[PDB]
Amino acid sequence: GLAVFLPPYPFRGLKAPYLWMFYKYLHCATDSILFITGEDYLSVTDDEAQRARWEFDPASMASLGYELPNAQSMACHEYLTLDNAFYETLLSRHHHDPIKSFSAFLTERIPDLETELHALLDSKKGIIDQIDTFISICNCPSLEHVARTLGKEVMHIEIGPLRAPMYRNTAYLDFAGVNGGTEASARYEKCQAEFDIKASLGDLHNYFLEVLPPAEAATHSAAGVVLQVEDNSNLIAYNHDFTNISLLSYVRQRYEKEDILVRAHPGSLFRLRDDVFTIDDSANSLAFINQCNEVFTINSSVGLEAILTGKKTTVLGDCSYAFINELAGASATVNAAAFYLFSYLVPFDLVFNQEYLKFRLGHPEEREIVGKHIEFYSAHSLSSLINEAISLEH
Amino acid sequence: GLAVFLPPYPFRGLKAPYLWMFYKYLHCATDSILFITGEDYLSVTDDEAQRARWEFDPASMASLGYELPNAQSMACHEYLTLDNAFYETLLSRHHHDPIKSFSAFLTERIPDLETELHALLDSKKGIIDQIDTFISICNCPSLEHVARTLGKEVMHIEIGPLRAPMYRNTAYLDFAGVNGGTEASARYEKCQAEFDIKASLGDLHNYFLEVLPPAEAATHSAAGVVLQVEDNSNLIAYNHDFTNISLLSYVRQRYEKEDILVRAHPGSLFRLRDDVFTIDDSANSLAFINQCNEVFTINSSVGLEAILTGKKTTVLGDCSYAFINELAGASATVNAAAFYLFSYLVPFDLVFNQEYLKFRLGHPEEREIVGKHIEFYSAHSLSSLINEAISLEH
Ligand SMILES: Nc1ccn([C@@H]2O[C@H](COP(=O)(O)O[C@@]3(C(=O)O)C[C@@H](O)[C@@H](O)[C@@H]([C@H](O)CO)O3)[C@@H](O)[C@H]2O)c(=O)n1
Ligand SMILES: Nc1ccn([C@@H]2O[C@H](COP(=O)(O)O[C@@]3(C(=O)O)C[C@@H](O)[C@@H](O)[C@@H]([C@H](O)CO)O3)[C@@H](O)[C@H]2O)c(=O)n1
């Protein structure tokens, strides 16, 4: 079966922080799977002092394609629960800074964590052997080390950078790292010679757009700045020490403040005062981007959007799509982006689909991977698969 | 004379960033002083695309006690100007992050900076010998190293944590460090035995309050969180890696979100969304504090305010006043705070007064220092000086 790691540790101050993926796996489940999680994920469903959370909102539920589990839905599966005192103990080893503790959880081994994991995984006999792969929603070297000892692979799975309703839903699936430490550039390097895509970057973008585009390229700001959620894993671990405020100061070295348009992240706790910069108020990030000559970001999904619409983009942090931007030729960039969208990214629902997971677990050729994504999307060389997908969809 | 260091480097994206202190020294000047600064501080006065800055606002001018210089006012003094390409070069040595470059400027030696300083300081003969002390508005180990080579002391001078109109204006003056690396705790340790202050912490606070207090201790939040300006020197260098967002997550480990009251810094670029926490909207930080049972801060001036009003205070960064909070007994805390307010802090105008600077340059006894501050404030042992000041002022 699948071993799904949904750590309960409330680093950002929220209990059961990955509850939406717990509900998505639980909704889509054909076989039993092993949850490695925390008591919180199980009791939130009945605790009334938190039904104002967004994972219980029918608009988020419909958008991610899940319904709330019931007693029978829970009982198909096995559960292993981590405890809190390791969390308390972890905080005190990092000066009671929960954000530094999160950083450590994302980027270093924690021996106590590993022992707890090793203990739960043979808490009952037969558990270990039934495990076909681990799935983790974030990088976790404690788990990756545990997985090596046992001979298990680790699929790192997260919602993608293109999302409904603006786009088809996409998801990440990467054996090395999600967001940080990814293998997207190395997968492309192995197959770049098979890519001869007869489309522009804009045509790639249109294939994935599910809406009429805004499209008012008239009136502009020389520079657009993308802000991110301040304590997102991207901004804690893979940011190269850039923050929202040093990103703005980066931009202000280069442009006067009258030439800068700044878009706060809708999900951030913080908004911009209407004092110094021109604050964007577009209904969506695509219409924000189309108002800017160039775009500056740490590692937000919106940077990919800026690259697919042809904009000069500066990417200051590590991310899965950076390598696309770093290519020289215009054609080289198109081919790298097409591999990215059609083969690195996965149609969102497949990463919760157990047979597609078995497929990826056999490490098939890039042609097979691209042919299975396009089949899902549309419901013979690799280049002609994509070229025709583009040509027919249009 | 005085050698005043007002670095022109626009780390926070603002030219002539320390312009208000340049205008305060220029207004108060009796003798010629040597400015070590940048071309920007001189041309801003005539550049019309920046008279919207707050240093030209008659309300800031009246509050800090200065008027704008004229041609004659400038001509009393000598000027030495730093150049920009060292700044450009510094940025590229820190991944073009201006906030990391600022951190380095505040906490490490920069050899190129030192050579530039050494060059300007004997650009003309006789400059060096006329220098009686350097004054710097922030810590700068390049300058401190330069000062040691030449045999000069460095006064670190900044606006204090108590400010008009809520309080008498105060200023910092410290030979080792301002904000970071201060000597306040070590000055107190040398004289603690001379301190027997017959007053409460509240009476200390009242001596400095210049307004009727708000005073509505009825209705409360278990926890108040103080946010700071995100790219302030305090939050770049002396913060122990705490940020506004990890401070909130620190508080959320300890209290539910319904028990937390959060005050953004009025000067920050960012305000809080009205979604998750109760956002304070008091007219001033004192009325915010009086609504909270305990107060959490990195190293904001408001933490001192919380300590003078008797509140349980948590201080997560380095600051000049921390040592007061770390004391055990109630009496011990009063005495440490009285030394802090009456002898560590300086009445704001004296730190621009050239004869008072000569006084401090002779390193007089704490009794002399306290007697000169109280004389300024009111216009014989150390304990009876303060006890009577408190008793008469009331
Ligand atoms: N200034 C911004 C930033 C984002 N968005 C919108 O918010 C979405 C997410 O972009 P993000 O910038 O990539 O958001 C974060 C981030 O802040 O870095 C937080 C959260 O989405 C989380 O999903 C992580 C990664 O998905 C972690 O795996 O990424 C975009 O696709 C876009 O719809 C926006 O409109 N404006
Ligand atoms: N949440 C806050 C923070 C501050 N203040 C008010 O703003 C003032 C400054 O407090 P600060 O928190 O100490 O402000 C900063 C800071 O953000 O740390 C920025 C700026 O004042 C600068 O003066 C530095 C030091 O003065 C640097 O020497 O300190 C307080 O005295 C108080 O009037 C407030 O009302 N609410």
TrEMBL record, chains A, B:
UniProt modified residues of type Cysteine sulfenic acid (-SOH): C28, C191
Domain of life: Bacteria
Domain Glycosyltransferase 99 N-terminal: 4-183
Binding positions for 3-deoxy-alpha-D-manno-oct-2-ulosonate per the UniProt entry: R12, E158, R163, N179, S233
Residues noted as binding CMP in the record, renumbered to the chain: L227, R263, A264, H265, S300, S301
Name of this chain's protein: Putative N-acetyl glucosaminyl transferase
Organism: Raoultella terrigena (Klebsiella terrigena)
